[PDB]
Amino acid sequence: GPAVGIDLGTTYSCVGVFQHGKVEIIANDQGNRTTPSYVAFTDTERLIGDAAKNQVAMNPTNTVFDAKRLIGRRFDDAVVQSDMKHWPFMVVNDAGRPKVQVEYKGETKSFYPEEVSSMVLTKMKEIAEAYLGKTVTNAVVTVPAYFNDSQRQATKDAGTIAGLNVLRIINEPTAAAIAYGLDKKVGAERNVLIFDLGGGTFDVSILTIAAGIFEVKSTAGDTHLGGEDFDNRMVNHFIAEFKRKHKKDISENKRAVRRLRTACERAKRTLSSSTQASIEIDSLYEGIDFYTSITRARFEELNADLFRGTLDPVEKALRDAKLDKSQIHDIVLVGGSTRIPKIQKLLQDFFNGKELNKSINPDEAVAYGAAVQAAILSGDDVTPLSLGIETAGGVMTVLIKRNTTIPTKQTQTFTTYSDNQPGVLIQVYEGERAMTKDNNLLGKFELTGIPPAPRGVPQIEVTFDIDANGILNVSAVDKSTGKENKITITNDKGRLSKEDIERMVQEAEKYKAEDEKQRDKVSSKNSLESYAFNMKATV
Ligand SMILES: N#Cc1ccc(COC[C@H]2O[C@@H](n3c(NCc4ccc(Cl)c(Cl)c4)nc4c(N)ncnc43)[C@H](O)[C@@H]2O)cc1
């Protein structure tokens, strides 16, 4: 009946469903609300989820994980080549694509990353079906905001292979914002910072929500920073302590290191709520029992550099979004590692004591929002687009930013581009792209009779006026003569849907770097030509 929302993560995945007016995070066959993104191949069977991770020490060369780091990418990507050196399983090239290679029932088998992701999605689908007691078909799957079209199509194909109808691919930070209802808040546009610290990845996203529209302003972070690194800091600390007390290095014994790491991770999770935790391991190495403790302050000291360095991607995302820290309206914690009190204190002090949105389980908020969006897609006055004019080089110069309260009036001064320019062609465009090629022409009019003058000397005042009904009047005045011209543009008729605005905003997101590189190509910013650039001859 209902559609599910799936957070397909690198190490863990989550599935939720909106029923009875409530989002429910679905527990698996072992009772866990999150399922490891592991696929294991043995002599007899294919294990997925908890069963696959529970035997990783026994079958490490045939237990696949972190397949999300490969999906949508080609084999010769530097990211893939760098990640291959850290995995116990083999990665091979097949016509320019990476594949994981394992042994299964005594035969060598290779799978594309989307195939392993399809196995994980099959597990999540079966979990949802066991919970709901019916076949689940429609689903919303989330991806990192920095995913390109290829990676998103690969994730959708992974969904399709698993028998899922992928209604839509949405961004994980957007899903986290939807779970908190930040798109349903009253007032002007809101700036949202999603701080996502999981088991092995760290993602900072800066979005702007305006009239229910999500625009990804910036993304940053560290693809190899998570709770596993904190566990490893603890493990090295305790190995040093054991070597210092009992004069023995336990690094030689793999099982001792495994037991120590499990104890350290559990003690870390304890330290999120207590100021100290105990480590009790019987016969850790050479019969010696290891019974010790660790304070929260010592744990923070062991991870001081990583904890404090989480703030640098925040600064980078703020700079790339052209926003001050005080301009952020909402802060959303996602990922289990955000339960660490020192991380929360660092983030809150950085924002001068602002409260953090953390009431939703940070391991489940992405699947929460995905389920909300799946239920929406299954059944559950401001300006819509930026308005501007074409300036020299055919670039878009915006006078009324998107999501501006009407009625409004905005005036800007422009000038001529060539010497002795007799007139200017005011060309009104609507869109979120830097070049007028990729925007929508609404109208144009000419302003002639400009007295001969050098370039940059004449002054042309251009005014955009939007009344309460949305009727757009654009006027141009020669400031040296008072001569004027104008045009009226009917901004009505329901010509745009919410999906149209979302598509235009996401296309502006996709070509952000090229739009920036071509916007600053022209030297002057308020120079008007006399012709239409998009109708000029080019090779
Ligand atoms: N069951 C279960 C389960 C639930 C969620 C996750 C995902 O966790 C990913 C990252 O989140 C880390 N983490 C988590 N993870 C949530 C979690 C909850 C319960 C269990 Cl049994 C486990 Cl072990 C993990 N809690 C933390 C905490 N309280 N303090 C510091 N770090 C915590 C976790 O150690 C890892 O670094 C993994 C397992």
Q: What is the dihedral of CA 245, 247, 253, 258, to 10 degrees?
A: 10
* Atom 25 of ligand 1, residue of closest alpha carbon: 336
In this structure, is the dihedral angle defined by the CA atoms of residues 147, 151, 153 and 155, taken in order, positive or negative?
Answer: negative
* Atom 14 of ligand 1, residue of closest alpha carbon: 336
Q: Do 70 and 159 belong to one domain?
A: no
Pocket test for ligand 1, best of 15, 34, 195 (most atoms within 8 A of CB): 34
Q: How far is the CA of 269 from the centre of ligand 1 (A)?
A: 7
The answer on whether 271 is annotated among ligand-binding residues is yes
In this structure, is the dihedral angle defined by the CA atoms of residues 159, 165, 171 and 174, taken in order, positive or negative?
Answer: negative
Packing angle, helices 512-519 and 498-510, rounded to 10: 70
Pocket test for ligand 1, best of 337, 338, 344 (most atoms within 8 A of CB): 337
Resolution value in angstroms: 2.0
Residue after which a domain boundary falls, among 111, 140, 169: 111
Q: How far apart are CA 312 and CA 292, in angstroms?
A: 34
Which of the residues 83, 196, 222, 515 is marked catalytic?
196
Q: Do 458 and 517 belong to one domain?
A: yes
Q: Considering its fold, how many domains does the chain have in total?
A: 5
Q: Do 172 and 117 belong to one domain?
A: yes
Q: Do 440 and 505 belong to one domain?
A: yes
Q: Residue 106 domain-assigned? A: yes
Domain that holds residue 105: 65-111
Q: Which amino acid belongs to residue 246?
A: H
Dihedral pair phi/psi, residue 496, rounded to 5°: -125, 140
Q: 169 with 155: CB under 8 angstroms? A: yes
Q: Residue 459 domain-assigned? A: yes
Strands (E), 80-150: 90-93, 98-104, 107-111, 138-143
Q: Name beta bridge partners: 46.
A: 41
Please indicate the experimental technique that yielded this structure.
X-ray
Place of tokens 């930070």: 173
Q: 419 with 459: CB under 8 angstroms? A: no
In this structure, is the dihedral angle defined by the CA atoms of residues 442, 448, 453 and 457, taken in order, positive or negative?
Answer: negative
Residue after which a domain boundary falls, among 349, 380, 411: 380
Q: 424 with 460: CB under 8 angstroms? A: yes
Q: How far apart are CA 417 and CA 424, in angstroms?
A: 9
Q: Do 169 and 21 belong to one domain?
A: yes
Q: How far apart are CA 470 and CA 38, in angstroms?
A: 54
Q: Residue 539 domain-assigned? A: no
Residue 221 near ligand 1, beta carbon < 6 Å: no
Residue 12 near ligand 1, beta carbon < 6 Å: yes
* Three-class HEC string of 366-433: HHHHHHHHHHHHHCCCECCCCEEEEECCCEEEEEECCCCECCEEEEEEEEECCCCCCCEEEEEEECCC
* Residue 510 designated active-site: no
Q: 392 with 200: CB under 8 angstroms? A: no
Q: Residue 491 domain-assigned? A: yes
Q: Do 466 and 525 belong to one domain?
A: yes
Tokens coding 151: 């990676």
CATH value at residue 297 = 3.90.640.10
Dihedral pair phi/psi, residue 509, rounded to 5°: -65, -45
Q: Do 431 and 520 belong to one domain?
A: yes
* Residue 196 designated active-site: yes
Q: Cβ of 446: how many Cβ atoms within 10 Å?
A: 13
List Cα–Cα distances, 7 to 25, 180, 313, 362, in angstroms. Answer: 11, 16, 23, 12
Q: 242 with 284: CB under 8 angstroms? A: yes
Q: Residue 295 domain-assigned? A: yes
Q: Do 389 and 525 belong to one domain?
A: yes
Q: How far apart are CA 89 and CA 86, in angstroms?
A: 9
Q: 33 with 363: CB under 8 angstroms? A: yes
Q: Do 354 and 288 belong to one domain?
A: no
Q: How far is the CA of 73 from the centre of ligand 1 (A)?
A: 28
Q: Cβ of 448: how many Cβ atoms within 10 Å?
A: 12
Residue 201 near ligand 1, beta carbon < 6 Å: no
Q: Do 330 and 417 belong to one domain?
A: no
Place of tokens 């401001």: 382
* Residue 68 designated active-site: yes
Q: How far apart are CA 265 and CA 334, in angstroms?
A: 19
Residue 337 near ligand 1, beta carbon < 6 Å: yes
Sorted by sequence, the CB contacts under 8 Å of residue 54 that are 6+ apart come out as none
Q: Which of 262, 258, 261, 238 is nearest to 248 (CA)?
A: 238
- The conformation of residue 141, written as its DSSP 8-state character, comes to E
CATH value at residue 70 = 3.30.30.30
Q: Do 213 and 345 belong to one domain?
A: yes
Q: Do 146 and 2 belong to one domain?
A: yes
Q: Residue 425 domain-assigned? A: yes
Tokens coding 62: 């045939």
Length of the chain: 539
CATH value at residue 32 = 3.30.420.40
Q: Which amino acid belongs to residue 203?
A: D
Q: Which amino acid belongs to residue 255?
A: R
Sorted by sequence, the CB contacts under 8 Å of residue 82 that are 6+ apart come out as none
